[PDB]
Amino acid sequence: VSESFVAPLEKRAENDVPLGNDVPIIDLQQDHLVVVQQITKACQDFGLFQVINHGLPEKLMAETMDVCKEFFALPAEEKEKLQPKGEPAKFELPLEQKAKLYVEGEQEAFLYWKDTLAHGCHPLDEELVNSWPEKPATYREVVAKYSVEVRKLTMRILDYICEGLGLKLGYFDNELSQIQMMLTNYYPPCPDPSSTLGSGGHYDGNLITLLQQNLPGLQQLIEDAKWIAVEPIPTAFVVNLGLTLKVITNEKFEGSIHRVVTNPTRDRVSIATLIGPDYSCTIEPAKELLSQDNPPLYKPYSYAEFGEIYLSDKSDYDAGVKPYKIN
Numbered sequence: 270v271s272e273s274f275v276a277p278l279e280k281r282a283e284n285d286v287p288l289g290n291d292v293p294i295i296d297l298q299q300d301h302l303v304v305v306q307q308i309t310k311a312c313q314d315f316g317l318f319q320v321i322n323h324g325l326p327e328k329l330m331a332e333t334m335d336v337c338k339e340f341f342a343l344p345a346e347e348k349e350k351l352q353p354k355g356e357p358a359k360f361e362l363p364l365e366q367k368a369k370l371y372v373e374g375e376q377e378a379f380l381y382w383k384d385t386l387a388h389g390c391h392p393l394d395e396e397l398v399n400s401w402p403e404k405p406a407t408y409r410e411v412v413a414k415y416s417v418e419v420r421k422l423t424m425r426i427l428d429y430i431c432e433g434l435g436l437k438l439g440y441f442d443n444e445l446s447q448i449q450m451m452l453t454n455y456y457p458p459c460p461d462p463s464s465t466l467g468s469g470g471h472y473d474g475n476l477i478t479l480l481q482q483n484l485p486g487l488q489q490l491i492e493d494a495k496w497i498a499v500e501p502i503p504t505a506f507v508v509n510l511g512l513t514l515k516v517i518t519n520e521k522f523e524g525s526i527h528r529v530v531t532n533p534t535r536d537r538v539s540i541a542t543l544i545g546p547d548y549s550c551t552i553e554p555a556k557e558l559l560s561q562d563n564p565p566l567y568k569p570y571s572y573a574e575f576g577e578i579y580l581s582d583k584s585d586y587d588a589g590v591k592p593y594k595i596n
């Protein structure tokens with residue numbers, strides 16, 4: 270493996286990470302109150318859960334994974350059209366909603382063993398969809414339907430979260446969910462998995478993420494610096510609560526800290542829908558939940574200012590919010 274991809278010793282993954290048997294799997298076709306209670310418990314104790322019987326068509330999930338795999342099978346010459354000035358774009362502000370291929374890493378500087386296609390999805394209009402990949406031919410029609418369906422499911426989950434917290438329904442149906450970034454992640458086979466990371470350990474900086482996977486590689490950090498493997502369920506969504514939701518709930522909910530490990534023999538594609546605030550938003554603990562017993566743990570901050578730190582400073586998982594901590 271190229272020196273560029275060698276992770277610092279302490280960040281390298283151990284070869285045998287155990288299955289997370291305690292990852293909540295939540296059936297959304299249970300009675301309404303049972304769903305609210307199970308989602309609430311998962312948000313308080315874990316910050317990562319899977320949803321099944323979630324109402325999003327299994328056929329559409331399969332068609333979306335197919336067209337995403339088809340995109341990454343495209344020739345080099347086609348992929349160049351998504352590389353501004355001949356190279357992948359960087360995860361840095363301004364983060365544009367037009368489709369680009371991205372490189373990612375940490376500044377002991379190293380790169381993640383990953384190619385990412387990213388674009389905005391909300392609101393859908395001709396200008397946005399015309400900025401998506403031209404190939405495969407069916408990408409735009411399949412991913413347009415997928416993005417609307419994933420958003421509908423995410424807003425359902427945010428209203429379950431509202432009921433669990435005692436916030437009015439639709440609390441997040443505003444500026445706090447107006448950006449929908451779809452990240453299609455491609456992990457090619459890696460000759461030295463013991464030295465590399467597909468994705469470094471992170472909170473998602475946004476509000477909430479729905480992740481579609483069909484192969485192993487996703488790992489979560491739980492108490493006592495233990496990593497566990499998240500079982501791939503091809504017809505489920507992994508829900509990762511973001512650092513933004515951790516702040517707004519005043520740490521009543523956990524954020525998901527997770528990473529992706531490489532594989533020596535086979536490639537892997539994942540589809541992450543990252544929903545969260547516009548860069549113009551002010552983030553603070555929900556005042557409705559604050560009291561003398563529950564004082565705010567964060568001062569109000571600019572999401573844009575947070576974003577710059579979150580994307581550049583990887584010294585700690587919550588480096589993005591450290592400047593805004595109080596009490």
Ligand SMILES: CN1[C@H]2C[C@H](OC(=O)[C@H](CO)c3ccccc3)C[C@@H]1[C@@H](O)C2
Nearest residue numbers: 360450452468471473474475543576579
């Ligand atoms: C592994 N990387 C993490 C950081 C970066 O995330 C982003 O780029 C999101 C995209 O919404 C973002 C969130 C909050 C503020 C700025 C950007 C790209 C990817 C994501 O999978 C999460």
Ligand SMILES: [O]
Nearest residue numbers: 473478541543
């Ligand atoms: O992510």
Ligand SMILES: [Sr+2]
Nearest residue numbers: 349352355356
């Ligand atoms: Sr190039």
Ligand SMILES: [Sr+2]
Nearest residue numbers: 398399400401
């Ligand atoms: Sr175009």
Ligand SMILES: [V+3]
Nearest residue numbers: 472473509527
């Ligand atoms: V993530």
